[PDB]
Design a protein around this ligand. Sequence first.
Ligand SMILES: CC(C)(COP(=O)(O)OP(=O)(O)OC[C@H]1O[C@@H](n2cnc3c(N)ncnc32)[C@H](O)[C@@H]1OP(=O)(O)O)[C@@H](O)C(=O)NCCC(=O)NCCS
Ligand SMILES: CN[C@@H]1[C@@H](O)[C@@H](O[C@@H]2[C@@H](O)[C@H](O[C@H]3OC(CN)=CC[C@H]3N)[C@@H](N)C[C@H]2N)OC[C@]1(C)O
Length: 268
Amino acid sequence: TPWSKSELVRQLRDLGVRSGDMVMPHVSLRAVGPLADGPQTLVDALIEAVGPTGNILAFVSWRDSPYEQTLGHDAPPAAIAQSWPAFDPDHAPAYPGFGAINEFIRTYPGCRRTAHPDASMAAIGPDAAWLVAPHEMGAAYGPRSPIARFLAHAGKILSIGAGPDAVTALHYAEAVARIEGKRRVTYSMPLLREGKRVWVTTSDWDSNGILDEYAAPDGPDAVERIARDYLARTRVAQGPVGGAQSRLIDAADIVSFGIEWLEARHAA
Ligand SMILES: CC(C)(COP(=O)(O)OP(=O)(O)OC[C@H]1O[C@@H](n2cnc3c(N)ncnc32)[C@H](O)[C@@H]1OP(=O)(O)O)[C@@H](O)C(=O)NCCC(=O)NCCS
Ligand SMILES: CN[C@@H]1[C@@H](O)[C@@H](O[C@@H]2[C@@H](O)[C@H](O[C@H]3OC(CN)=CC[C@H]3N)[C@@H](N)C[C@H]2N)OC[C@]1(C)O
């Protein structure tokens, strides 16, 4: 029997989600199980759980982000630069690898989208505009990003059947950690400014591993190691949402634990 919207709201309430909360979900729909009206059922339950004064923030990125196509170049290669589509935030599909739920979140009426094509965030609620802008190239997940403002607003990280590697907010801890040898990457993204495509090339922290030892793809990254150490030492509300076991994490607390985790293991 498919999970109903009211059943999920009760589960989210037991987990600790309150009206007015600012929640960042990381979801595995296969772990949730069949829903009454598909993935939209979970989206409706999330929005009812946070209430009218609450907010939902999701890292949705972009299905056609030219990350690897421009990685390590001073400029987009000629073939990429001429024909690649401009990132239209209100029309660009989410990256499917980060969760099929995000395309349902992105297309919810009233949802806002940040202008960073690769690190694009989706936000629903009264603070959606403040969350999504600004989001410049070179500030993907650190200060001045939607993650930073999410951390300054008592945000809660809701992992629904997702592994510890999914804690995207921990990339802020990597960005501000005062450690030596931090990895950086250079890529180019096509922005849509006033109907005109504008290519922007920037450098930023490597979101696939802040240090070399955490960047092997086979391959637990710094996000997974920090989250597992945190979840092993911290009392976190855990319970079912649908068929998936879930956690409601204090975003500012795990990011503070992440900065201390990195700076305790690597010199300045
Ligand atoms: C990676 C991860 C998504 C994999 O878990 P998953 O359940 O296997 O993947 P999804 O959540 O996208 O669920 C996919 C299911 O929904 C289906 N689906 C996709 N789009 C659909 C749509 N429009 N309508 C109905 N069903 C759809 C998929 O087909 C699939 O179902 P199927 O296998 O029976 O065909 C999950 O483990 C996770 O970690 N999520 C958080 C990731 C994140 O936030 N990353 C940010 C960078 S760290
Ligand atoms: C859309 N373009 C994408 C580009 O944004 C970037 O995506 C990053 C992504 O891997 C990271 O998630 C994975 O990390 C690892 C191993 N490191 C294991 C599984 C995942 N948790 C996330 N933490 C940060 C993302 N920015 O690289 C790939 C890309 C497809 O090009």
